[model samples]
Target: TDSFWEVGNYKRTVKRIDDGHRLCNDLMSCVQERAKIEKAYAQQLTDWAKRWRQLIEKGPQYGSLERAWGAMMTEADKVSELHQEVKNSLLNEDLEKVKNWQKDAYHKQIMGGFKETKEAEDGFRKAQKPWAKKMKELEAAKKAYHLACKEERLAMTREMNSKTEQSVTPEQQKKLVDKVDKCRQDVQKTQEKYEKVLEDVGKTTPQYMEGMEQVFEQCQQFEEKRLVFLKEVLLDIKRHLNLAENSSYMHVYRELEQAIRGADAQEDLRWFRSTSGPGMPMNWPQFEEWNP
Candidate 1:
């Protein structure tokens, strides 16, 4: 008399439906939450990447290494170029990968699993009507049969507090058996329909599975490019962290400065007014200035 159903008939089958319904919802939530987090991280990576490019821009154009300064200037130019190139790869390639993964895989493709189970739940709910009806019929049939037996037993026992070989009318007994068997057949028929909905939960669509397989595949590709981006940025940092920003290399200017503080860093040589190619001053009296 309870609203039992053919679909929920077996303990195992009902649990399977409940678990599957809940699982689809749970998986959907996981996919959505992870996307929010991953997208935030990707944006954070982008910001840090931009910040790294600034490090190169802000680096020193050396003002103090004598002849060495020119070479270091050229080297600094190359560092800026390398920083731009590496950051370009990260922004265009690595960040692109992250966006594509969220768009192509997690954003939409992940819904397939949830959709798959949702269809199962909907199908089961849709079919509940007939399945429950069949179960109700079966329950009533079983009760009728049970009452028939009870009536016969009660008849036999009523004659005494002792047993007698008493049975219900043969016609009534046969009718009760028929009703139970017929209802059982009805249960089997409705159960077949119910089982079909359950069966789908056991399998996945190949079209979707192929795409999902590539979800992991694209991630492999993404991480390889992402790691390369990181390696480029880190190597760039290590390469230039001490050179342009820190002025340790500029300490060579100090002796030059100490001359202004006192004398003799270049007292012997008169640096020609024209920035000449690295050269010694000409000492022919006509060509050189002599106070003497």
Candidate 2:
């Protein structure tokens, strides 16, 4: 709170609030970058699935293992589709939320809304102006008063020297005394002015402090709001990145697990033996003569 009373600290606080605008932009950029990554990941997943599916269909692999391999490719495609959805959420929901929040929070000068920080700073200046001017005037008056008092003392010393150290006429003595009196008068006038300005400054002090306090409180509230909003924005970003928690994303891997569990090697070997091996009844060689 005392920090706000100082100029540099107050400006720093306002700057911090201003930085919130850029912070939001940074958040959006991060999300945008993440969205791009998600999109690329989705595309790659699909391509990988496609390539492997083609390879499986054309290769010599057969039976339950082949089925499981095909299921793996299908799972990859499913995962790819889910990742596409993730990209969509980032671009459409999370990014848009950030954009909208920034738009609402920071008002451009061209638009109808006013800049709150600028207005508050201006208020601080306005509140301090009168007392500040009075203080300057008081300082000048005090300096002038001091100078006049010194001149009067010098004049008194000259008059005393003239009377004792040297022979001087009563007329010259009167003149010196008159000069001292004039200087005294000047000092009195300056003193009066100084006192008057000082009194006015005293009168304005309470009002100045009150006004500054009010303005500082407003700035504090503005900063608090920004911080709260930023906290929520960060949490939202975390929520968006939680891909494992997403049902569709998790479902694809579960399907892959099921496929892997169902891939019975014995069943595959039996099918292979039946279709391509000793399951075919071959004629055993008896005593047959070789035809040359």
Candidate 3:
């Protein structure tokens, strides 16, 4: 009887799991909702980083700044894993079957996609020793130019602050001219050196400002493909989890229209208490504390 089919046991088991399953649904809805916006927010930084990455790729390629984020674009990559684990546990397959199917789904849908991203990273790094030194040199020259400007400014400031204006002699004037002239010549030479380096960089490897962004775009193309494949797999798992039920995770709200900048007093409260909760009316005593 234990090894064989039994209708009553199956029915009782399903009923026993219903409340726990509903809680898991609530868990899922919250997880998806939180992940939805969290992913989008991180993506803003990631997209900004991608632009920076393109600029840095040609030069420093994989310098400290390049690795500064340390998987910023790839953060919460575990969310994808959590999706599979949670769904598999809920779907009521026997233990071995579930693990086998999960392994199959993972290998077939996700693993290779990420491996390809790694390979893309390796390939992008081949820009290699050729570009890194040039970038460092160009960066050093830029910093030196700034230091030269600061030196001239400090020299002028000291001259302005320390010299006696009314009591100054012609000898003092000549000495002041000579001092300023020396500063100018030194500053002028450094400026010329920096400018020549800048010009050399432009002429030699004008492409040095860019980075692994092209490979990133290629990895992103694979991400889209992976998402599509996983969608079918995940949708099927949802069916297995709720075969007897009519499922509705319902309207998880993210209306972009409401996200725009606004100045308004739509102080209505009808829909608010109903959808959100009770005891949250417009003139509630909590408002007194909020205002203070």
TM-score of each: 0.27, 0.77, 0.36
Q: Write the per-residue lDDT of candidate 2 for residues 73-104, one digit (tens) a residue.
A: 88878888877877888888888987998888
Candidate 3's TM-score reads 0.36
Q: Which pairs clash (backbone N, Cα, C closer than 3 Å) in model 2? A: none
Where model 2 places Cα greater than 4 Å from the true spot, the runs are 1-17, 111-114, 149-181, 281-292
Q: Scored by CA lDDT, what does every candidate get?
A: 0.45, 0.80, 0.48
Model 3: lDDT to the true structure: 0.48
lDDT of 1 at 22: 48
Query: How far is each candidate from the true structure, as Cα RMSD in Å?
Result: 15.3, 4.5, 35.0
Residue 205's C-alpha lDDT in candidate 1? 35
Q: Which predicted model would earn the best lDDT?
A: 2
Model 2 shows how many backbone clashes? 0
lDDT of 1 by residue, 107-224 (tens): 2225444333343444445445444555555565555555555555555444343223366566645565555555555555555555554454334234334533343344346445
